[PDB]
């Protein structure tokens, strides 16, 4: 009921919470940085206005960090296999959804900062689409927190 190979799933859930959110945040930072460093050569005044897709990418990695710390502080040697399965699910829920949120933030941020220098009114539309792209990772954060709140609830 609480076997020896049970914290393997918890360690993979602690790893995958930060690994895939860092992959998503790294795709978002790379795409948005290629966008910024190609649109702020000619328009350097709106450089610090365009760093918002990179911040939205970094909040995804913060979401992964929080879940990985909370799964890390619930590991144990003699824990249940249910706890390991819930921690694996909570790691994957935030990781493979923050990866998708990072893909969306990178694509929207590149396409928005390459066209926001031409049209100044497109910035409040880019922020609005990136809010919907960052709520995609906030949903995985909520699912991971609700899973990890029940990892040790009625456990023998």
């Amino acid at each position: 009921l609480c076997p020896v190979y049970a914290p393997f799933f918890g360690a993979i859930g602690c790893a995958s919470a930060i690994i895939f959110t860092s992959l998503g945040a790294a795709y978002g930072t790379a795409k948005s940085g290629v966008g910024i460093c190609a649109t702020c050569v000619l328009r350097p005044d709106l450089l610090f206005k365009n760093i918002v897709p990179v911040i939205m990418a970094g909040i995804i990695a913060i979401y992964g960090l929080v879940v990985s710390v909370l799964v890390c502080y619930s590991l144990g040697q003699k824990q249940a296999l249910y706890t390991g399965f819930i921690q694996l699910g909570a790691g994957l829920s935030v990781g493979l959804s923050g990866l998708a949120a990072g893909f969306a933030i990178g694509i929207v941020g590149d396409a928005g900062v390459r066209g926001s220098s031409q049209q100044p009114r497109l910035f409040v539309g880019m922020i609005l689409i990136l809010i919907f792209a960052e709520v995609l990772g906030l949903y995985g954060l909520i699912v991971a927190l609700l899973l990890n709140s029940r990892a040790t609830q009625d456990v023998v």
Partner: protein, 56 residues
């Protein structure tokens, strides 16, 4: 701004009727408006008035 760099004084030339009134600030004269109201009061307004020549 950040879609254009300026670091040197820029000018806009306007001419308006001398009976005009701004509707962005009703109760003002155009001359009084330029100095006080216009871009946070930081507008420098300069004379540029010229008289009549001879028109064919």
């Amino acid at each position: 701004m950040a879609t254009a760099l300026y670091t040197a004084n820029d000018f806009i030339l306007i001419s308006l009727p001398q009976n005009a009134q701004p509707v962005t600030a009703p109760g003002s004269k155009t001359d009084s408006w330029f100095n006080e109201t216009l871009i946070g009061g930081r507008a420098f307004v300069s004379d540029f008035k010229i008289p009549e020549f001879k028109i064919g």
